[PDB]
């Protein structure tokens, strides 16, 4: 049993989003499908579900109005569509198969919608140089859109002791985070770091020197 | 509530539906006596009653007709007859705390063996000796009850368990408590199994000239046959007459 | 119906015996067999299947986990606590039509607390050029997560200006590690002089105080 | 539920003990109650009963001659008579009261009575200097009536590694103790130890220095 | 009734399986209930009641201590030993008019053997003024606690002139501490030369002898 989805759509608001779930490792048409909804760091909420046999759909009263299922049996795919999309509905959706008398038995990955009027922008990163043991330096990596970025440092050189921290969504709709790492005091002035930041959807590569 | 003070409520007016009795997945004993567990739907009853307490796991043996123990013996004791059923479920997750749950108690001491469906709430101390008591706790004096101490690292034997038992009240007489059967039309004159609300016969159904007071319910002639009956709907005197039968 | 999670944030050492508890508003049980299911999510997959009814277990799933209870309360084991035990625990209903999960559970492995390591980062020379400047406060390997963070700028306690963020368990130290942004406009910070971090943790005997001067 | 004795009571042979017990959280008119007599670091005898309603007082074959139980309901006190003290009746009595149908089943504190003819005395510190890594040092204290006295290091400068021994009943009728510290070989001639030895009831107050 | 208590002194280490046991004279069960009851007495503080009956457990007694038996056998278990558990346990039945108790057993946190660090301790010269001659053998931080201490003036045994006395336990070491004073006139004390402390113990291979010459 095998579920396949689409690939962190990202929808200005108002717009309306098309999702798919394939289906392979069964008959798909014994088993009815569910979606189910996670905002980040939450708890999961329960869409609706549709018999692929016949088209009977069932909706959570929160999602009746803005949610719509279909399926097609001669694809064996199974789509949810979101419409009027608002801030709340960015989130992981999972389509699920049924087994052992649970509603959602079976997940499929899980596929990320991301519903913002903002545009991609490159990453800004800077030093966070070391204050004038064992000592602590980083980057600070700004106005980014969309997630997510690669940091690392010295290529891979300086693995121990990094700490990239997630990004968190600002006021003004981009991502800022912070990527540190603790060195030797002995280190100060001899060893090179950089920290080297890769983001793919805006195509920035930036590889910043921190020094003391 | 405790064995010792058992609750109990009266059922009466109601259509009895037993689906939580079927549907329920907590339940460990199930035992009906007089009745068939899975009949319940298609009886009329008198009048039933629901005692409800919280009993030890190893005492649940002693809820039945004829049994013996301190449960049976000063707490809760049930008639030989006893029409109807114990339902008991295991309460270990609910009725048990980290370091004791106390408040459940039952009776250690009583002077005689309590008649069925006697319950004793007195706290008296209890006189074991000779000498007399007089309201004083002392070397032959006890309080009459002792509490159960559940902790939830215990033996299934010494965990709780929630215990139900239904006394039902079956006769001829008009019953109040009913499944619901989706009661239908009535035809007259026509030989039929009628099921007036319990009463039940197969015959024809006559217009009766029969003048029943308001509290009578169904009329029994001589031999003590029943031989006319009122329908609940509608309330009117109906004679039943058994359909003509002879040999050939 | 409404499942209440308790608690559903449990910090046990390895070997220790794990329990998260579902509490329903009314009956799951219904045609003789329970519909309380148990769901596990380890971080970035999705959530699979432990538990399907009161106590069966599912595919590919250690005896570790163990479900029990019936009614309204349910109960989840783990007693051989290992390391891939981490995770987010689910408790969902199936005897009604809306499929109700539960709170959600971080099941976190215990350890002895751990001193956080307090640092305080001005902002950038380049930052300061762009009319912007974000002061960082950095707490490395310290355990548990319950720490409160606080912004004094000349002796002034800041609200409503700080973003925090906080780095997931580390999967050998087990130790959180945090990062707080104080973000400013240049005319605001070069305003003032002195601004410090002042941290109270579990494992500090007295909050500790990191400070610096502009200039 | 709380009883409150007397405290330490001492009295020479011959003479009669009054012993009261004080009972509060209760009704005091339905719970009897006992008495229970310990020697210092040994077992637990049962001395005797008393209702409190009616007073029919029940007594141990041993204790029946020198023992007499009394209650008052209107304080809501219990008094034991100890009458023809001797050596052996030197001893911690307690109070109790029935309950989960153990006679002495809740216990109040506890009274000492000491049977003796001796008189209070002054004790005698006397220093037991280290033999010429650690070294060992201490005072003892000789001859003092009645116990308890306090001992400390320094004004409680010195406690790591200190053993205050209990002390001992001697043949003269006084009591002997010992305390005792441990101390660095390099600490022998510079750190100053004083043993500070406090005798309330006699009210003797007396540092001795201990040296080397 | 007469209730002997085996074993009244038990040494058992923390997490580990301690077991106290009554026997009496005669039936202690009475009206169908046991009339066996087990008391703890902390140094210090009066007795208070663990199990009331045969088994069942006292007001704000640990699920540790459990009370089992009847007819004149009864046992006492604390699998779960805790350090708060050093106490003198006591079994007392209530079957009978005079209340009997047990002999008592005082549990105490098991430990590796230690060795004994012995020292001596002359008399002081002011002592030596009043007439009078302590001499002072010392143990410290030894297990377990038997010991046996043996006083030897010019060669010769000593008996009937030393008083020992056993501080209790340690809270954090476990190791008993001991104290033998020898007292002798000033008259007899100057007419021998060598005092000797001569100890066995079980951490010793050998006898170890602590001696001094007086002057
Ligand atoms: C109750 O009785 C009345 C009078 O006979 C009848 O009209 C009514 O339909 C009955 N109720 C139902 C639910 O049929």
């Not at chain 2, 109601?14 to 009886?43: E, W």
Request: net charge neutral; hydrophobic share 30%; with cysteine.
């Amino acid at each position: 049993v095998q579920l396949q989805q689409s690939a962190a759509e990202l929808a200005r608001p108002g717009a309306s989003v098309k999702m798919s779930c394939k289906a392979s490792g069964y008959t798909f048409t014994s088993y009815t499908m569910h979606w189910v909804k996670q905002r980040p760091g939450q708890g999961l909420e329960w869409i609706g579900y549709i018999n692929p046999t016949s088209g009977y759909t069932e909706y959570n009263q929160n999602f009746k109005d803005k949610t719509t299922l279909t399926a097609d049996k001669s694809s064996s795919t199974a789509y949810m569509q979101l419409n009027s999309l608002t801030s709340e509905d960015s989130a992981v959706y999972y389509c699920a198969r049924e087994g052992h008398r649970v509603g959602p038995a079976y997940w499929g990955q899980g596929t990320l919608v991301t519903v913002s009027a903002a545009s991609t922008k490159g990453p800004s990163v800077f030093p966070l140089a070391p204050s004038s043991g064992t000592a602590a330096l980083g980057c600070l990596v700004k106005d980014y859109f969309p997630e997510p970025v690669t940091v690392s440092w010295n290529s891979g050189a300086l693995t121990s002791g990094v700490h990239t921290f997630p990004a968190v969504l600002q006021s003004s709709g981009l991502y800022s985070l912070s990527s540190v790492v603790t060195v030797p005091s002995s280190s100060l002035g001899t060893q090179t770091y950089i920290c080297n930041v890769n983001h793919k959807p805006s195509n920035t590569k930036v590889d910043k020197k921190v020094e003391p | 509530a405790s064995v010792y003070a058992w609750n109990r409520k009266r059922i009466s007016n109601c259509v009895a539906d037993y689906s939580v009795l079927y549907n329920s997945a907590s339940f460990s004993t199930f035992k009906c006596y007089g009745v068939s567990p899975t009949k319940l739907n298609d009886l009329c009853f008198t009048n039933v009653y629901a005692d409800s307490f919280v009993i030890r796991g190893d005492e649940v043996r002693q809820i039945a007709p004829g049994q013996t123990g301190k449960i049976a013996d000063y707490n809760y004791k049930l008639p030989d007859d006893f029409t109807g059923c114990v339902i008991a479920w295991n309460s270990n997750n609910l009725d048990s705390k980290v370091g004791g749950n106390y408040n459940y108690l039952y009776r250690l001491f009583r002077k005689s063996n309590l008649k069925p469906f006697e319950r004793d709430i007195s706290t008296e101390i209890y006189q074991a000796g000779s000498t007399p008591c007089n309201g004083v706790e002392g070397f032959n004096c006890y309080f009459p009850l002792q509490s159960y101490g559940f902790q939830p690292t215990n033996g299934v034997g010494y965990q709780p368990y929630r215990v139900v038992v239904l006394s039902f009240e079956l006769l001829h007489a008009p019953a109040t408590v009913c499944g619901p059967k989706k009661s239908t039309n009535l035809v007259k004159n026509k030989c039929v199994n009628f099921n007036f609300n319990g009463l039940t016969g197969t015959g024809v159904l006559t217009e009766s000239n029969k003048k029943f007071l308001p509290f009578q319910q169904f009329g029994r002639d001589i031999a003590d046959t029943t031989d006319a009956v009122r329908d609940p709907q509608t309330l009117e005197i109906l004679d039943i007459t058994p359909c003509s039968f002879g040999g050939v | 119906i409404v499942l209440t999670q308790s608690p559903a944030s449990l910090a046990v050492s390895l070997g220790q015996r794990a329990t998260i508890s579902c509490r329903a508003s009314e009956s799951v049980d219904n045609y003789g067999i329970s519909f309380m299911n148990w769901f596990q999510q380890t971080p970035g997959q999705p959530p699979k299947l432990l538990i399907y009814g009161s106590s069966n277990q599912g595919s590919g799933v250690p005896a570790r986990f163990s479900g029990s209870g019936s009614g309204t309360d349910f109960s989840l084991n783990i007693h051989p606590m290992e390391e891939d035990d981490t995770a987010m625990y689910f408790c969902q209903q199936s005897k009604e039509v809306p499929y109700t999960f539960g709170g959600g559970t971080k099941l976190e492995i215990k350890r002895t607390v751990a001193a956080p390591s307090v640092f305080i980062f001005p902002p950038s020379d380049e930052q300061l050029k762009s009319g912007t400047a974000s002061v960082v406060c950095l707490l490395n390997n310290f355990y548990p997560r319950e720490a409160k963070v606080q912004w004094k700028v000349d002796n002034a306690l800041q609200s409503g200006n700080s973003q925090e963020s906080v780095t997931e368990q580390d999967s050998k130290d087990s130790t959180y590690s945090l990062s707080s942004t104080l973000t400013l406009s240049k005319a605001d910070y070069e305003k003032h002089k002195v601004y410090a971090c002042e941290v109270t943790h579990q494992g500090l005997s007295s909050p500790v105080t990191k400070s610096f001067n502009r200039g």
